[PDB]
PDB file of C-alpha atoms and ligand atoms in Angstrom:
ATOM      1  CA  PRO E1273      -6.440  26.594   3.980  1.00 51.32           C
ATOM      2  CA  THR E1274      -9.689  27.238   1.238  1.00 51.98           C
ATOM      3  CA  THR E1275     -13.310  25.407   2.213  1.00 47.83           C
ATOM      4  CA  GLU E1276     -11.908  23.829  -1.243  1.00 46.99           C
ATOM      5  CA  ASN E1277      -8.350  22.444   0.992  1.00 46.40           C
ATOM      6  CA  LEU E1278     -10.673  22.132   3.498  1.00 45.89           C
ATOM      7  CA  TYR E1279     -12.793  18.852   1.654  1.00 47.75           C
ATOM      8  CA  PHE E1280      -9.267  17.210   0.566  1.00 45.45           C
ATOM      9  CA  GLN E1281      -9.006  15.231   3.001  1.00 41.27           C
ATOM     10  CA  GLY E1282     -12.716  13.827   2.980  1.00 41.37           C
ATOM     11  CA  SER E1283     -12.003  12.932  -1.146  1.00 42.02           C
ATOM     12  CA  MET E1284      -9.106  10.403   0.330  1.00 44.04           C
ATOM     13  CA  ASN E1285      -9.045   7.159   1.726  1.00 41.72           C
ATOM     14  CA  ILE E1286      -7.056   3.981   1.789  1.00 41.25           C
ATOM     15  CA  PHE E1287      -8.704   3.610  -1.797  1.00 43.13           C
ATOM     16  CA  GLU E1288      -7.330   6.430  -3.050  1.00 44.92           C
ATOM     17  CA  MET E1289      -4.222   6.448  -1.727  1.00 47.21           C
ATOM     18  CA  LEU E1290      -3.185   2.851  -2.916  1.00 45.95           C
ATOM     19  CA  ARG E1291      -5.104   3.749  -6.401  1.00 45.06           C
ATOM     20  CA  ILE E1292      -1.711   6.947  -6.891  1.00 45.72           C
ATOM     21  CA  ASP E1293       1.390   4.830  -5.293  1.00 47.22           C
ATOM     22  CA  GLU E1294       0.252   1.571  -7.352  1.00 46.92           C
ATOM     23  CA  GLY E1295      -1.280   3.731 -10.353  1.00 47.72           C
ATOM     24  CA  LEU E1296      -4.330   1.798 -12.878  1.00 44.72           C
ATOM     25  CA  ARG E1297      -2.586  -0.531 -15.790  1.00 44.74           C
ATOM     26  CA  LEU E1298      -5.074  -3.127 -17.020  1.00 44.18           C
ATOM     27  CA  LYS E1299      -2.494  -5.420 -18.726  1.00 39.50           C
ATOM     28  CA  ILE E1300       0.595  -7.737 -17.183  1.00 37.00           C
ATOM     29  CA  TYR E1301       3.172  -5.496 -16.218  1.00 40.06           C
ATOM     30  CA  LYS E1302       6.615  -6.255 -14.052  1.00 40.87           C
ATOM     31  CA  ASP E1303       6.668  -3.572 -10.897  1.00 39.18           C
ATOM     32  CA  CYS E1304       9.979  -2.125  -9.704  1.00 34.66           C
ATOM     33  CA  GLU E1305      11.276  -4.789  -9.020  1.00 33.71           C
ATOM     34  CA  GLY E1306      10.695  -6.764 -11.521  1.00 34.41           C
ATOM     35  CA  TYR E1307       7.229  -8.464 -10.500  1.00 35.72           C
ATOM     36  CA  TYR E1308       4.535  -9.453 -12.795  1.00 31.29           C
ATOM     37  CA  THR E1309       1.724  -6.911 -11.803  1.00 33.80           C
ATOM     38  CA  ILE E1310      -1.696  -6.209 -13.023  1.00 31.99           C
ATOM     39  CA  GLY E1311      -4.469  -3.922 -11.736  1.00 30.42           C
ATOM     40  CA  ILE E1312      -4.143  -1.756  -9.348  1.00 30.25           C
ATOM     41  CA  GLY E1313      -1.120  -3.061  -7.290  1.00 29.76           C
ATOM     42  CA  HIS E1314      -1.492  -6.892  -7.653  1.00 26.37           C
ATOM     43  CA  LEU E1315       1.412  -8.618  -7.114  1.00 25.72           C
ATOM     44  CA  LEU E1316       0.503 -12.282  -9.610  1.00 26.62           C
ATOM     45  CA  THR E1317       3.232 -13.755  -9.263  1.00 26.94           C
ATOM     46  CA  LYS E1318       7.243 -13.735  -8.027  1.00 27.72           C
ATOM     47  CA  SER E1319       8.012 -16.386 -10.893  1.00 26.99           C
ATOM     48  CA  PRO E1320       9.991 -14.404 -14.047  1.00 28.34           C
ATOM     49  CA  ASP E1321       7.320 -17.108 -15.745  1.00 26.68           C
ATOM     50  CA  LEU E1322       4.918 -14.883 -17.783  1.00 25.87           C
ATOM     51  CA  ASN E1323       2.768 -18.359 -17.548  1.00 28.00           C
ATOM     52  CA  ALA E1324       2.523 -18.483 -13.901  1.00 25.64           C
ATOM     53  CA  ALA E1325       1.416 -14.813 -14.122  1.00 25.95           C
ATOM     54  CA  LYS E1326      -1.563 -15.513 -16.571  1.00 26.16           C
ATOM     55  CA  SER E1327      -2.391 -18.530 -15.021  1.00 27.86           C
ATOM     56  CA  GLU E1328      -2.652 -17.030 -11.669  1.00 26.63           C
ATOM     57  CA  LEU E1329      -4.668 -14.297 -14.002  1.00 24.68           C
ATOM     58  CA  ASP E1330      -7.387 -16.385 -15.235  1.00 26.32           C
ATOM     59  CA  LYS E1331      -7.038 -17.387 -11.236  1.00 26.18           C
ATOM     60  CA  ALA E1332      -8.144 -14.762  -9.447  1.00 24.46           C
ATOM     61  CA  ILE E1333     -10.164 -13.561 -12.115  1.00 25.46           C
ATOM     62  CA  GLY E1334     -11.904 -16.642 -13.472  1.00 22.61           C
ATOM     63  CA  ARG E1335     -12.109 -16.056 -16.984  1.00 18.78           C
ATOM     64  CA  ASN E1336      -9.882 -16.544 -19.731  1.00 19.23           C
ATOM     65  CA  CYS E1337      -8.283 -12.728 -19.339  1.00 19.22           C
ATOM     66  CA  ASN E1338      -4.740 -13.196 -21.587  1.00 18.14           C
ATOM     67  CA  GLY E1339      -3.284 -10.724 -19.395  1.00 18.40           C
ATOM     68  CA  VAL E1340      -6.013  -8.247 -19.635  1.00 16.01           C
ATOM     69  CA  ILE E1341      -8.344  -6.654 -17.649  1.00 17.43           C
ATOM     70  CA  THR E1342     -11.222  -4.198 -17.363  1.00 17.06           C
ATOM     71  CA  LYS E1343     -11.365  -1.501 -14.311  1.00 16.34           C
ATOM     72  CA  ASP E1344     -14.132  -2.937 -13.063  1.00 13.14           C
ATOM     73  CA  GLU E1345     -12.412  -6.520 -12.321  1.00 15.58           C
ATOM     74  CA  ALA E1346      -8.886  -4.181 -11.186  1.00 15.53           C
ATOM     75  CA  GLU E1347     -11.125  -1.965  -8.853  1.00 16.92           C
ATOM     76  CA  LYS E1348     -12.668  -5.760  -7.320  1.00 19.27           C
ATOM     77  CA  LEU E1349      -9.029  -7.581  -7.094  1.00 16.94           C
ATOM     78  CA  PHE E1350      -8.300  -4.106  -5.602  1.00 17.53           C
ATOM     79  CA  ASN E1351     -11.198  -4.185  -2.911  1.00 17.97           C
ATOM     80  CA  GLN E1352     -10.349  -7.606  -1.932  1.00 21.14           C
ATOM     81  CA  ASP E1353      -5.952  -6.944  -1.692  1.00 22.39           C
ATOM     82  CA  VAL E1354      -7.284  -3.962   0.518  1.00 23.31           C
ATOM     83  CA  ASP E1355      -9.751  -6.484   2.021  1.00 22.80           C
ATOM     84  CA  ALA E1356      -7.259  -9.088   3.022  1.00 20.08           C
ATOM     85  CA  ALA E1357      -4.352  -6.689   4.285  1.00 19.02           C
ATOM     86  CA  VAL E1358      -6.699  -5.376   6.389  1.00 18.16           C
ATOM     87  CA  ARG E1359      -7.576  -8.595   7.664  1.00 15.91           C
ATOM     88  CA  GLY E1360      -3.631  -9.229   7.734  1.00 14.00           C
ATOM     89  CA  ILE E1361      -3.187  -6.749  10.100  1.00 15.11           C
ATOM     90  CA  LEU E1362      -6.531  -6.909  12.437  1.00 15.37           C
ATOM     91  CA  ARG E1363      -5.407 -11.056  13.632  1.00 14.07           C
ATOM     92  CA  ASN E1364      -1.691 -10.285  13.739  1.00 16.87           C
ATOM     93  CA  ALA E1365      -0.010 -10.105  17.478  1.00 20.69           C
ATOM     94  CA  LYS E1366       2.480  -7.877  16.811  1.00 15.96           C
ATOM     95  CA  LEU E1367       0.494  -5.206  13.852  1.00 17.23           C
ATOM     96  CA  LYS E1368      -2.544  -4.863  16.159  1.00 17.85           C
ATOM     97  CA  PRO E1369      -1.450  -3.229  18.657  1.00 16.55           C
ATOM     98  CA  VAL E1370       0.142  -0.389  16.924  1.00 18.43           C
ATOM     99  CA  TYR E1371      -2.546  -0.312  13.764  1.00 18.38           C
ATOM    100  CA  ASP E1372      -4.728  -0.031  17.659  1.00 16.71           C
ATOM    101  CA  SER E1373      -2.958   2.765  18.771  1.00 19.20           C
ATOM    102  CA  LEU E1374      -2.508   4.643  15.309  1.00 22.44           C
ATOM    103  CA  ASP E1375      -4.645   7.895  13.849  1.00 24.82           C
ATOM    104  CA  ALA E1376      -7.099   7.011  10.436  1.00 24.66           C
ATOM    105  CA  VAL E1377      -4.733   8.775   8.394  1.00 23.80           C
ATOM    106  CA  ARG E1378      -1.565   6.834   9.480  1.00 20.79           C
ATOM    107  CA  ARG E1379      -3.211   3.299   9.982  1.00 22.53           C
ATOM    108  CA  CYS E1380      -4.300   4.012   6.158  1.00 22.52           C
ATOM    109  CA  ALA E1381      -0.883   4.300   5.936  1.00 20.68           C
ATOM    110  CA  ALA E1382      -0.604   0.913   8.005  1.00 14.04           C
ATOM    111  CA  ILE E1383      -2.571  -0.640   5.746  1.00 12.41           C
ATOM    112  CA  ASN E1384      -0.772   0.588   2.441  1.00 13.15           C
ATOM    113  CA  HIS E1385       2.365  -0.816   3.535  1.00 11.35           C
ATOM    114  CA  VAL E1386       1.200  -4.299   4.383  1.00  9.99           C
ATOM    115  CA  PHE E1387      -0.546  -4.316   0.839  1.00 10.60           C
ATOM    116  CA  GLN E1388       3.125  -3.342  -0.151  1.00  8.52           C
ATOM    117  CA  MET E1389       5.048  -5.247   1.424  1.00  5.61           C
ATOM    118  CA  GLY E1390       2.977  -8.080   3.364  1.00  4.47           C
ATOM    119  CA  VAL E1391       2.685  -8.929   7.564  1.00  5.19           C
ATOM    120  CA  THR E1392       5.777 -10.432   7.705  1.00  8.96           C
ATOM    121  CA  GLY E1393       7.656  -8.142   6.367  1.00 12.99           C
ATOM    122  CA  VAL E1394       5.536  -5.217   8.205  1.00 15.51           C
ATOM    123  CA  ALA E1395       6.525  -7.679  11.354  1.00 19.32           C
ATOM    124  CA  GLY E1396       9.641  -6.780  10.820  1.00 19.79           C
ATOM    125  CA  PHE E1397      10.430  -3.625  11.164  1.00 22.28           C
ATOM    126  CA  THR E1398      10.489  -4.062  14.970  1.00 20.04           C
ATOM    127  CA  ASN E1399      11.715  -0.595  15.703  1.00 20.16           C
ATOM    128  CA  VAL E1400       9.644   1.178  13.385  1.00 20.75           C
ATOM    129  CA  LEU E1401       6.643  -0.630  15.339  1.00 20.51           C
ATOM    130  CA  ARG E1402       7.169   0.426  18.534  1.00 21.40           C
ATOM    131  CA  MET E1403       8.181   4.398  17.052  1.00 23.92           C
ATOM    132  CA  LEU E1404       5.120   4.139  15.737  1.00 27.83           C
ATOM    133  CA  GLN E1405       3.689   2.570  18.822  1.00 32.01           C
ATOM    134  CA  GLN E1406       5.448   5.962  20.712  1.00 28.66           C
ATOM    135  CA  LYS E1407       4.746   8.975  18.967  1.00 27.35           C
ATOM    136  CA  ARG E1408       8.011   9.217  17.716  1.00 24.45           C
ATOM    137  CA  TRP E1409       7.071  10.343  14.125  1.00 26.20           C
ATOM    138  CA  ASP E1410       9.948  11.601  12.668  1.00 26.07           C
ATOM    139  CA  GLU E1411      12.121   8.482  13.775  1.00 25.80           C
ATOM    140  CA  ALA E1412       9.959   5.796  12.484  1.00 25.98           C
ATOM    141  CA  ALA E1413       9.955   8.070   8.800  1.00 28.75           C
ATOM    142  CA  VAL E1414      13.435   8.276   8.749  1.00 31.36           C
ATOM    143  CA  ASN E1415      14.291   4.421  10.064  1.00 28.36           C
ATOM    144  CA  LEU E1416      11.412   3.394   7.356  1.00 25.20           C
ATOM    145  CA  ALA E1417      13.970   5.657   4.784  1.00 26.72           C
ATOM    146  CA  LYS E1418      16.448   2.772   5.494  1.00 23.20           C
ATOM    147  CA  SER E1419      14.880  -0.004   4.006  1.00 22.52           C
ATOM    148  CA  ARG E1420      14.546  -1.772   1.051  1.00 22.46           C
ATOM    149  CA  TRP E1421      10.823  -1.413   0.960  1.00 20.54           C
ATOM    150  CA  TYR E1422      11.310   2.095   0.238  1.00 18.43           C
ATOM    151  CA  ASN E1423      15.119   1.460  -1.425  1.00 18.03           C
ATOM    152  CA  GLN E1424      14.193  -0.914  -4.258  1.00 15.08           C
ATOM    153  CA  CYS E1425      12.077   1.418  -5.342  1.00 14.09           C
ATOM    154  CA  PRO E1426      11.457   5.332  -3.731  1.00 13.76           C
ATOM    155  CA  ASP E1427       8.002   6.584  -5.850  1.00 14.85           C
ATOM    156  CA  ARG E1428       5.873   3.914  -4.543  1.00 18.00           C
ATOM    157  CA  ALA E1429       6.635   4.331  -1.274  1.00 14.30           C
ATOM    158  CA  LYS E1430       7.628   8.002  -0.692  1.00 14.30           C
ATOM    159  CA  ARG E1431       4.158   9.092   0.300  1.00 15.96           C
ATOM    160  CA  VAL E1432       3.539   6.909   2.383  1.00 17.58           C
ATOM    161  CA  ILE E1433       6.321   7.132   4.876  1.00 15.09           C
ATOM    162  CA  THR E1434       5.524  11.105   4.310  1.00 11.63           C
ATOM    163  CA  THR E1435       2.155   9.829   5.986  1.00  9.81           C
ATOM    164  CA  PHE E1436       3.758   7.963   8.508  1.00 10.00           C
ATOM    165  CA  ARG E1437       5.788  10.979   9.560  1.00  9.88           C
ATOM    166  CA  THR E1438       2.275  13.631   9.473  1.00  9.79           C
ATOM    167  CA  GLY E1439      -0.762  11.796   9.414  1.00  8.15           C
ATOM    168  CA  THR E1440      -1.362  13.494   6.700  1.00 10.11           C
ATOM    169  CA  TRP E1441      -2.847  13.597   3.089  1.00  9.32           C
ATOM    170  CA  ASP E1442      -0.866  16.290   1.906  1.00 10.47           C
ATOM    171  CA  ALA E1443       1.474  14.265   0.135  1.00 14.84           C
ATOM    172  CA  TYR E1444      -1.150  13.222  -1.970  1.00 13.31           C
ATOM    173  CA  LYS E1445      -1.929  16.589  -3.062  1.00 14.44           C
ATOM    174  CA  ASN E1446      -0.564  18.447  -6.205  1.00 12.67           C
ATOM    175  CA  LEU E1447      -0.081  15.394  -8.361  1.00 11.54           C
TER     176      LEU E1447
HETATM  177  C1  1DV G1299       5.510  -0.337  10.367  1.00  7.71           C
HETATM  178  C2  1DV G1299       3.925  -0.890  10.096  1.00  7.71           C
HETATM  179  C3  1DV G1299       3.606  -0.502  11.639  1.00  7.71           C
HETATM  180  C4  1DV G1299       2.533  -1.198  11.236  1.00  7.71           C
HETATM  181  C5  1DV G1299       1.287  -1.637  11.528  1.00  7.71           C
HETATM  182  F1  1DV G1299       0.492  -2.231  10.956  1.00  7.71           F
HETATM  183  F2  1DV G1299       0.404  -0.273  11.561  1.00  7.71           F
HETATM  184  F3  1DV G1299       0.905  -1.695  13.378  1.00  7.71           F
HETATM  185  N1  1DV G1299       2.464  -0.867   9.730  1.00  7.71           N
HETATM  186  N2  1DV G1299       3.610  -0.378   9.013  1.00  7.71           N
END
């Protein structure tokens, strides 16, 4: 690896990781599962009612948005959502010990996974949790690739799975 390649891990963190997986959109859109989304992966609601999504947006941002936000507002919401996912892991009796056992890069993959799926969803991968704690990375990655989370929307999940496999940032290189 070049001097520049060795610097690349210092440029990657949970914010950059999720920014790649979720993208950045300033207008309400439907995600791969058809849920109204905005910003960097902010799920507004699971209701099919666009009006509900706009109401949630205005609540979340604190002004009359009519379905559009600024980059700065997207980033604020993004930071709040990342903090929520981290807090969700750390207060959970099942996730915390697994997360604690992980290296820094795999901890990012964990926060990412919880950001995407929510705490109970993630805690439901009983076997994968045990595999991660036991450093059975290949098996963990194979089992993650069976999940509806990955299979329903592979492009959003694939990088995270690879990261659980390797504990490196390689999946986020050369976009
Ligand atoms: C499958 C899984 C476990 C985890 C965590 F949060 F580290 F426990 N995140 N994703």
